[PDB]
């Protein structure tokens, strides 16, 4: 039973515990139970995998999970999403640097505590529901079935502090007819290290992250699948999830709407980053593999392709993709004897109304 604890600006205090047993009872199958807790998320799963579905090396694995998400604690317009479901996925190895995934999933979503807002209600209207705009004490449940696929490319020279090679992850999903929702969702992550000097102490890192999803036949993608940008892992110098559309709230009685700086996310995202890794200035004793220093330029955007700017002239056009946030700063990573250490200082030099600045960001971790 292995644990882990962490503390950072993006998710607060993280707790992790799990255990893995292979060849369970001499049957070939592997079993595991894993759980994670955030300031905004509690997650737990149970998996049973067969690495010999075919002699060719194809694996057939199952998953049973529950997830509780409290959007207010992630700094989004308030709502609660308690979900659970199952997943069956095949994994195909292609070569040393490539692998594929194909699977089917079921997921139930229980939504509650939705503070009425325009974009969120636009999705609900597309689902035939007509909840009041004056009551946060509401409820909406869905049951979906999905096809899931993924591709992983990885040819790095080493896992920790890579100096050369690229990493690419592609994931996609789409609902199967008969589900409640009708939509698709795709994401692309890339990272490319290029060494400048012969000794690989000066390195250029280029990272990209893309996401796009949309509904089918009148329906929209559910707001609880939105993408988010801003924070330590996307655009440093911005508070986690602040980048993109902000909530437009309905009035409360027990066309007059309220502006806000509460992020909500969007169904389209584009994030890029250029990082210049250098040797640490006074720590170059020739055994400096424990620290990595870099300067970076981050940028990203998140928009709502279904925002109807004409009906909401008094409020920004949240469908425009061109409001590109940008930042620049410094970062230090350290494999210290107390655990992994990462911190950065960044300044946003391109902001938009409502965006929340967070110049200093860090993450601390311990594994036992």
């Amino acid at each position: 039973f292995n644990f882990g604890i962490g503390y950072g600006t993006e998710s607060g205090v993280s707790f992790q515990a799990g255990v893995q047993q292979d060849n369970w009872l001499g049957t070939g199958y592997a079993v595991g139970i894993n759980g994670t807790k955030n300031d905004y998320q509690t997650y737990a799963e149970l998996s049973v995998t067969n690495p010999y579905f075919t002699v060719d090396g194809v694996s057939l694995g199952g998953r049973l999970f529950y997830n509780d998400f409290q959007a207010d604690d992630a700094d989004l317009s308030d709502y609660t999403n308690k979900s659970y479901g199952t997943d069956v996925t095949l994994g195909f190895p292609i070569n040393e640097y490539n692998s594929l995934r194909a699977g089917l999933g079921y997921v139930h979503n229980s939504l509650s505590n939705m503070q009425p807002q325009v974009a969120m209600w636009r999705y609900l209207y597309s689902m035939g529901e007509h909840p009041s705009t004056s009551d946060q004490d509401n409820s909406f449940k869905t049951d979906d079935f999905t096809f899931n696929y993924g591709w992983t490319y990885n040819k790095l020279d080493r896992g920790y502090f890579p100096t050369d090679g690229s990493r690419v992850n592609l994931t996609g999903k789409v609902t199967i007819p008969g589900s409640d929702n009708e939509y698709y969702k795709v994401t692309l992550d890339t990272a490319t290290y290029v060494p400048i000097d012969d000794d690989h102490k000066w390195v250029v890192l280029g990272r990209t992250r893309w996401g796009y999803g949309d509904g089918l036949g009148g329906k929209e993608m559910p707001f609880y699948e939105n993408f988010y940008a801003g924070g330590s892992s996307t655009v440093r110098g911005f508070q986690s999830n602040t980048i993109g559309p902000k909530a437009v709230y309905f009035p409360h009685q027990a066309k007059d709407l309220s502006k806000s700086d509460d992020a909500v996310g969007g169904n389209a995202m584009a994030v890029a980053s250029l990082e210049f890794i250098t040797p640490t200035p006074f720590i170059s004793d020739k055994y400096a593999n424990s620290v990595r220093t870099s300067f970076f330029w981050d940028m990203g955007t998140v928009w709502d392709t279904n925002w109807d700017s004409s009906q909401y002239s008094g409020y920004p056009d949240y469908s425009d993709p061109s409001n590109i946030r940008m930042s620049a700063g410094i970062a230090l990573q350290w494999m210290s004897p107390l655990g992994p250490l990462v911190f950065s200082y960044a300044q946003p030099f391109k902001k938009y109304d409502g965006d929340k600045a967070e110049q200093f960001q860090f993450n601390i971790g311990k594994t036992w």
Partner: nanobody
Amino acid sequence: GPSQVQLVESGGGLVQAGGSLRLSCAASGRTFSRYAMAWFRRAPGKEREFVAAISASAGTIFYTDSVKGRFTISRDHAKNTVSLQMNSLRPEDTAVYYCAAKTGTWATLDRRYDYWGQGTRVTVSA
């Protein structure tokens, strides 16, 4: 000092129908986290209802239609201190006004807030 987060309401009292009152609320002790803060109220016969909220950044302000246009919620320059300026009051504003705090985004439901104050009485005479 206190053994937990404490919210202390100040202001309030007796005012004429068309008068004004300024309430305040402050998180006692030392809190290193920024809180969204809100005002609720419970009338003599009715149940506890929402009045106004303001985000931690103060960028989001929200009122119930009853008091919209008459009340004004604002964050003080100090840590986690909010005020509620109530103008053109009315006998239907009489109630115990409670202060509520919350880390993360604001909300209208009382169960979403993590800390509450003891409340202050507000009385409006016809």
